[PDB]
Amino acid sequence: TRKCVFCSKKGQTIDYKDTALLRTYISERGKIRARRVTGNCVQHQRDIAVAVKNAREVALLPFGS
Amino acid sequence: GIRKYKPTTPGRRGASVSDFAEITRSTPEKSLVRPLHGKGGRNAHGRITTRHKGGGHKRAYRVIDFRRHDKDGVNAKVAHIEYDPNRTANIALLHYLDGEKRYIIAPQGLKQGDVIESGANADIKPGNNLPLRNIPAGTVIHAVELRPGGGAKLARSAGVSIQLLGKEGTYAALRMPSGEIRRVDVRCRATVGEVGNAEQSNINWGKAGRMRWKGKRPTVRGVVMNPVDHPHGGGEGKTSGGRHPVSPWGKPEGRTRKPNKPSDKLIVRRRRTGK
Amino acid sequence: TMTDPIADFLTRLRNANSAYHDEVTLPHSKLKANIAEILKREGYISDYRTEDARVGKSLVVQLKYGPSRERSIAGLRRVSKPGLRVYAKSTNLPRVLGGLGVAIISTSSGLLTDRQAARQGVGGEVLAYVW
RNA sequence: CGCAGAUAUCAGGAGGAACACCGGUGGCGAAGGCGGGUCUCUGGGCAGUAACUGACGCUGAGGAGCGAAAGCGUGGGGAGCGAACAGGAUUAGAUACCCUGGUAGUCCACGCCGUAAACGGUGGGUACUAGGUGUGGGUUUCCUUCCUUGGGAUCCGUGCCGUAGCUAACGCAUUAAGUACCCCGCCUGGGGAGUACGGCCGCAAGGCUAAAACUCAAAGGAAUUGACGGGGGCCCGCACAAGCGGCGGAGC
RNA sequence: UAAUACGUAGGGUCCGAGCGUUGUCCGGAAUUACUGGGCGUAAAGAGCUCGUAGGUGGUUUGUCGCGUUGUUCGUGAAAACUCA
Ligand SMILES: [Mg+2]
Ligand SMILES: [Mg+2]
Ligand SMILES: [Mg+2]
Ligand SMILES: [Mg+2]
Ligand SMILES: [Mg+2]
Ligand SMILES: [Mg+2]
Ligand SMILES: [Mg+2]
Ligand SMILES: [Mg+2]
Ligand SMILES: [Mg+2]
Ligand SMILES: [Mg+2]
Ligand SMILES: [Mg+2]
Ligand SMILES: [Mg+2]
Ligand SMILES: [Mg+2]
Ligand SMILES: [Mg+2]
Ligand SMILES: [Mg+2]
Ligand SMILES: [Mg+2]
Ligand SMILES: [Mg+2]
Ligand SMILES: [Mg+2]
Ligand SMILES: [Mg+2]
Ligand SMILES: [Mg+2]
Ligand SMILES: [Mg+2]
Ligand SMILES: [Mg+2]
Ligand SMILES: [Mg+2]
Ligand SMILES: [Mg+2]
Ligand SMILES: [Mg+2]
Ligand SMILES: [Mg+2]
Ligand SMILES: [Mg+2]
Ligand SMILES: [Mg+2]
Ligand SMILES: [Mg+2]
Ligand SMILES: [Mg+2]
Ligand SMILES: [Mg+2]
Ligand SMILES: [Mg+2]
Ligand SMILES: [Mg+2]
Ligand SMILES: [Mg+2]
Ligand SMILES: [Mg+2]
Ligand SMILES: [Mg+2]
Ligand SMILES: [Mg+2]
Ligand SMILES: [Mg+2]
Ligand SMILES: [Mg+2]
Ligand SMILES: [Mg+2]
Ligand SMILES: [Mg+2]
Ligand SMILES: [Mg+2]
Ligand SMILES: [Mg+2]
Ligand SMILES: [Mg+2]
Ligand SMILES: [Mg+2]
Ligand SMILES: [Mg+2]
Ligand SMILES: [Mg+2]
Ligand SMILES: [Mg+2]
Ligand SMILES: [Mg+2]
Ligand SMILES: [Mg+2]
Ligand SMILES: [Mg+2]
Ligand SMILES: [Mg+2]
Ligand SMILES: [Mg+2]
Ligand SMILES: [Mg+2]
Ligand SMILES: [Mg+2]
Ligand SMILES: [Mg+2]
Ligand SMILES: [Mg+2]
Ligand SMILES: [Mg+2]
Ligand SMILES: [Mg+2]
Ligand SMILES: [Mg+2]
Ligand SMILES: [Mg+2]
Ligand SMILES: [Mg+2]
Ligand SMILES: [Mg+2]
Ligand SMILES: [Mg+2]
Ligand SMILES: [Mg+2]
Ligand SMILES: [Zn+2]
């Protein structure tokens, strides 16, 4: 199991501005992948989902094109 | 709300009414009243045209501004939301900064002290009138008109009002309470917000006396008429009339609209039942 | 709710004997001190003590065990409890293990053992049957 | 259901229900139960400073509030799904399993009804009692890169396994059934029957409180081995398959 | 159809001037569990909360002692039980 990449204090914050950051965690299909593969916080993942899905509603990530 | 009456006497057990706790006045603005009278369901000839109607409690008519275009760009205050029996809904009097008092229909949730503006610049808050060029698609409106200044004619329904759908060219499509969609010109005028007295349909008459009050007389059933006076008349006992029900003048159920109307093209589709 | 300090103390003692402890810490009280007097003078608890803690004075109990690991106290059951309280007359003093046990009796002089009460002719409330 | 142009497939429009992945043996809630987002008002739980009150504590007969789904009233809504209901089919028989459809309901608003295997089949609260393996929450402190599930300690909730003990056993095993304490519900063989009569509640369906007679001399719980299974894994036989020749036809 | 369980015989057992049946009541029945029960499934924790009355209390500093035991004489009929 790999590390909680976000969860350093040196690491970047959590938000929805980072379209590249959210793309890096959303697959090419456009779905949310699993913690079992991503290896980050369960909490961090909660934040990631909130940010990515805010971006989706603001039309920043494809809706299964 | 609703207050169900307590069954003191038998003829008063089922009588439930709506409380008019919101009214503020007890005598209508006298500068805006005209003489009216139960017409008795008779035309210039005097022969009864429509049955069941006539007699009842006399009522005083008041002119109310469905023409609400004669004043623009001048606000008015909601003076008093009073009751007129002649109409289903409630009429609220407005004080204009100009100095006119005019009657209008009272939309749902309107209370004394609010502001009213009428024109193409008004806000979208309920109670404002403005041609449909300036009204967002999807909103709920009432007291609609049928042409640019012919006076509102539709959706006076106490408790229900029309829904705007979409603007194309110079027409707008309306979802409207009969369940029907009407194409209509967009130069007409309308007002935003559902009409008031949404609970008026909750009334339970409950007493033939009050039905008479409201004015309509009794209906004489069909199969009981004599055969001479009506198609189902006759039959020693109870006999269905031996034929499919029919209007007293010999036309049974079924389509009645005269298609081809000038508005036949303006209509989009037709109302649905049991769908 | 600590609604029976005596019961809780006795439960702690027997539980510590079962778990094979050496020291048991409890909040200190006058009744605890005099009951420790009784038991230590009878020889069931190796020695007690009263110390000072962050808030209130407490006590630690030092037990013994039989030379072959033997437990010092076999059974502990309260008799007079909140709600159900039991007293005894000068003649009907309770008998535990036919005298092989010690019953703590509250009499005018204070708390004394069953033999002390029987010889003095005094009586009171029996606290606990210790064996 | 289609040759009246079906399916598919593409443009547009309508509209209702519900939000995969995040999403797990995870959060919260006292309990039912609750998760697409945004805002609005707001409840509950936890960590350090421990400032202040200072025996106010606990739990609770009656009472009263909450309380899944189904059901009922009123008026809206009603895509999908779908009791009941029609047909098609299997079957000796099918008022079912399956198919075509398809009305209540399913959703909204306000009232209702108060029962579930409402289960962790375990009432609430406090104190004590070896460990191992994880989550999430918040704190500190040090190898200190001071990056770091690096290391230490702490308290809250949350999964499993396990000593001693307990237990009828299966099993529980510090989030006890252990060893105690305080209070409350409840039970005394099986039917009869949670039903008859009665009282209370409900508009109802019914709900709550709760009998007797007569009959049976057992009914039930965990567990041991068989037997069997249109329950699973590994095996063998002219068992199957591939071949010949056959009896069931006639006389004898 | 071949009874130590029916009846007859013998033989045996208990008891005895009484012996059985029946019926009422206690017991074993800890089978209404105060002494001295249980609640997972065998019968049982209500569906879960707040909370009135009642029931119950986290400490030590202080008196009256009404809860209490402490002893002295002072009542407890006779008759019945226990000792001689
Ligand atoms: Mg966060
Ligand atoms: Mg009536
Ligand atoms: Mg007047
Ligand atoms: Mg008039
Ligand atoms: Mg004429
Ligand atoms: Mg009529
Ligand atoms: Mg007249
Ligand atoms: Mg009216
Ligand atoms: Mg219509
Ligand atoms: Mg008629
Ligand atoms: Mg007639
Ligand atoms: Mg005539
Ligand atoms: Mg005729
Ligand atoms: Mg007739
Ligand atoms: Mg007839
Ligand atoms: Mg007709
Ligand atoms: Mg004390
Ligand atoms: Mg006891
Ligand atoms: Mg298509
Ligand atoms: Mg202080
Ligand atoms: Mg209580
Ligand atoms: Mg209380
Ligand atoms: Mg109660
Ligand atoms: Mg009560
Ligand atoms: Mg309530
Ligand atoms: Mg209530
Ligand atoms: Mg439901
Ligand atoms: Mg429902
Ligand atoms: Mg019905
Ligand atoms: Mg209803
Ligand atoms: Mg309806
Ligand atoms: Mg619909
Ligand atoms: Mg069906
Ligand atoms: Mg059928
Ligand atoms: Mg269907
Ligand atoms: Mg029930
Ligand atoms: Mg549930
Ligand atoms: Mg409970
Ligand atoms: Mg407890
Ligand atoms: Mg274990
Ligand atoms: Mg052991
Ligand atoms: Mg426990
Ligand atoms: Mg138990
Ligand atoms: Mg019984
Ligand atoms: Mg019952
Ligand atoms: Mg009853
Ligand atoms: Mg009942
Ligand atoms: Mg069992
Ligand atoms: Mg077995
Ligand atoms: Mg073969
Ligand atoms: Mg042959
Ligand atoms: Mg043959
Ligand atoms: Mg014989
Ligand atoms: Mg015999
Ligand atoms: Mg004999
Ligand atoms: Mg007896
Ligand atoms: Mg018992
Ligand atoms: Mg049971
Ligand atoms: Mg229960
Ligand atoms: Mg119940
Ligand atoms: Mg005295
Ligand atoms: Mg005396
Ligand atoms: Mg005396
Ligand atoms: Mg005498
Ligand atoms: Mg005697
Ligand atoms: Zn993290």
CATH of the domain at C112: 3.30.1490.10
Q: Are residues C39 and C93 in the same domain?
A: no
Please give the nucleotide, over all strands, whose C1' is closest to the CA of residue C4: D181
Q: Are residues C82 and C39 in the same domain?
A: no
Q: To what resolution in angstroms was this structure determined? A: 2.5
Instruction: Report the C-alpha gap between B131 and B118 in whole angstroms.
Output: 10
Within 7 Å of a protein beta carbon, the nucleotides of strand D are 13-15, 20-24, 26, 36-38, 57-58, 74-77, 79, 125-130, 135-138, 147-149, 164, 174, 178-183
Q: Are residues C7 and C66 in the same domain?
A: yes
CA B76: distance to chain centroid? 25
- What is the Å distance from ligand 15's center to C127 Cα? 97
Q: Are residues C4 and C65 in the same domain?
A: yes
Helix/strand/coil for B71 = coil
User: What dihedral angle (degrees, nearest 10) is formed by the CA atoms of C93, C98, C103, C107?
Assistant: 30
- What is the Å distance from ligand 40's center to C17 Cα? 21
Please give the nucleotide, over all strands, whose C1' is closest to the CA of residue B202: D75
- What is the Å distance from ligand 52's center to B223 Cα? 85
- What is the Å distance from ligand 38's center to C1 Cα? 19
Instruction: Name the residue type at position C66.
Output: G
> Do residues B246 and B231 lie in contact, with contact meaning Cβ atoms separated by under 8 Å?
yes
- What is the Å distance from ligand 51's center to B149 Cα? 108
The CATH number of residue C9's host domain is 3.30.1370.30
Instruction: Report the C-alpha gap between C108 and C106 in whole angstroms.
Output: 7
Q: Cβ atoms within 10 A of the Cβ of C29, count?
A: 17
Q: Are residues C97 and C41 in the same domain?
A: no
The Cα-based distances of C122 to A6, A10, A20, B117, C113 in angstroms read: 77, 79, 90, 100, 11
Domain extent at residue C111: 74-131
Q: CA(B102)–C1'(D237) in Å? A: 107
Residue nearest to nucleotide D127 (CA to C1'): C8
> Do residues B71 and B100 lie in contact, with contact meaning Cβ atoms separated by under 8 Å?
yes
Instruction: Name the residue type at position C83.
Output: G
Of the residues C57, C73, C89, the one at which a domain ends: C73
Q: Are residues C65 and C121 in the same domain?
A: no
Tokens representing B214 are 């409201």
Q: Are residues C64 and C92 in the same domain?
A: no
Q: CA(C58)–C1'(D216) in Å? A: 65
What sign has the CA pseudo-torsion C112, C118, C120, C125? positive
Q: Cβ atoms within 10 A of the Cβ of B72, count?
A: 14
Q: Cβ atoms within 10 A of the Cβ of A5, count?
A: 15
Return the ligand number nearest the Cα of B45: 5
Please give the nucleotide, over all strands, whose C1' is closest to the CA of residue C88: E69
Instruction: Report the C-alpha gap between B274 and B256 in whole angstroms.
Output: 19
User: What dihedral angle (degrees, nearest 10) is formed by the CA atoms of B189, B191, B196, B201?
Assistant: 50
For residue C49, what is the enclosing H or E element? Answer: none
Instruction: Report the C-alpha gap between B91 and B64 in whole angstroms.
Output: 8
Q: Are residues C9 and C20 in the same domain?
A: yes
Strand locations in B134-248 (E)? 141-142, 163-168, 171-176, 180-185, 189-192
Q: Is B203 exposed, middle or buried (0-12, 13-18, 19+ CB in 10 A)?
A: middle
Residues in CB range of B228: below 8 A, 6 or more apart: none
Q: Are residues C63 and C78 in the same domain?
A: no
Q: Are residues C61 and C2 in the same domain?
A: yes
Q: Are residues C23 and C78 in the same domain?
A: no
